[PDB]
Structure 1
Amino acid sequence: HMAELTPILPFLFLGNEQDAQDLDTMQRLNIGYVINVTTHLPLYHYEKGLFNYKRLPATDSNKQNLRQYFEEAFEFIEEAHQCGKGLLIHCQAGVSRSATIVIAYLMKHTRMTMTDAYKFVKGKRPIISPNLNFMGQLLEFEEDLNNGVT
């Protein structure tokens, strides 16, 4: 597999589970942190002691709450940021879970509207599968940011 570790920001990369298995590319991009946004995929390289792994144990379903993990993900992204290392956030094909988290990060920490952040991510990673539940959670999150509640 030819991994596509999509650079959203200089240190923030988006990919699927085949991308997350490409050890050589991950090391070449100075990635030091991995967020696995799934309940069931391996921490593929855990036993090599190369990356700081975090699991956000979410399914790609119409009932899954991802909003509950946003702040945890943001803190870990800021750790990689301040450490000068890259972070890969991934789930499965179509990246619905990991792209939602990236979009939320852009909204809160780079002052983007939800629509602009979605279009920004889709401009770099053209295939993003729909999850209407996650769309609604981004919309509630946008409303909360605009009301100063988060």
Structure 2
Amino acid sequence: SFPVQILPNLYLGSARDSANLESLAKLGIRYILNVTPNLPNFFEKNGDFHYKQIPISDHWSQNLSRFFPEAIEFIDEALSQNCGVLVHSLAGVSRSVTVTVAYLMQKLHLSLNDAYDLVKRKKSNISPNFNFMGQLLDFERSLR
């Protein structure tokens, strides 16, 4: 129905949200971060949209932190251009959330928990994944 907004211009959603051209127009979203190895980038042929896809999966949760830097860079481009960006996965209750938490951690200088609290308050359906949590803690460490 609608992706939830986390920070101004930063939206968190599902694969359903990624295919709703009407919903993306309403929210001013022109950037889409597809955090799955296989979901479609519906409006790829549309020069107005900017796509970025990262093959994140629980099958290989150990590679995650490695993708945080390019994800954060993409989200920053959207926000710097003062454009909305949608971060999504399939159900959108784990992979998209993890990447979004990582972004918050870096930009707002927040610990994993504080960053997580911001998302929890906006989204009530988050599924735990300790491998992902461990990856976030490693990232928390790299930030210091």
Is TM (by shorter chain) over 0.5? yes
**Counterpart for residue 144 of structure 1:** 142
CA pair 64-49 structure 1, distance change in 2 beyond 3 A: farther
Query: Residues 53-80 of structure 1: CA distance to partner in whole angstroms, max 9, x if unpaired?
Result: 1101122335441111111011111111
**Counterpart for residue 11 of structure 2:** 13
Give the CA deviation at 1:48.
3.5
Give the CA deviation at 1:50.
3.4
Give the CA deviation at 1:83.
0.8
**Counterpart for residue 129 of structure 1:** 127
Aligned residues: 144
Q: 2:139 & 2:99 partners in 1: Cα distance?
A: 11
Q: 1:102 & 1:12 partners in 2: Cα distance?
A: 9
Query: Residues 75-102 of structure 1: CA distance to partner in whole angstroms, max 9, x if unpaired?
Result: 1111111111000000011431111111
**Counterpart for residue 33 of structure 2:** 35
Identity of aligned residues (%): 47
**Which amino acid letter does the alignment assign opposite residue 53 of structure 1?**
Y
Q: Give secondary structure in 2 for the equivalent of 1:46.
A: coil
Q: 1:70 & 1:62 partners in 2: Cα distance?
A: 15
Query: Which consecutive residues of structure 1, in runs of 5 or more, have no partner in the other structure?
Result: none
Q: 1:4 & 1:101 partners in 2: Cα distance?
A: 19
Q: 1:87 & 1:74 partners in 2: Cα distance?
A: 11
Q: 1:63 & 1:77 partners in 2: Cα distance?
A: 21
**Which amino acid letter does the alignment assign opposite residue 50 of structure 1?**
D
Query: Which consecutive residues of structure 2, in runs of 5 or more, have no partner in the other structure?
Result: none
**Which amino acid letter does the alignment assign opposite residue 9 of structure 1?**
L
Query: Residues 1-22 of structure 1: CA distance to partner in whole angstroms, max 9, x if unpaired?
Result: xx22110011100001111111
**Which amino acid letter does the alignment assign opposite residue 44 of structure 1?**
F
**Which amino acid letter does the alignment assign opposite residue 13 of structure 2?**
G
Q: Which runs of 4+ in 1 moved over 4 A?
A: none
**Counterpart for residue 74 of structure 1:** 72
Asked if the contact 2:13–2:92 (Cα under 8 Å) also holds between the matched residues in 1, the reply is: no
Asked if the contact 1:30–1:86 (Cα under 8 Å) also holds between the matched residues in 2, the reply is: yes
Give the CA deviation at 1:132.
1.3
Asked if the contact 2:15–2:92 (Cα under 8 Å) also holds between the matched residues in 1, the reply is: no
Q: 2:47 & 2:62 partners in 1: Cα distance?
A: 30
TM-score by length of 2: 0.93
RMSD: 1.4
Q: 2:9 & 2:92 partners in 1: Cα distance?
A: 21
Which of 45, 48, 66 does residue 46 from structure 2 map onto? 48
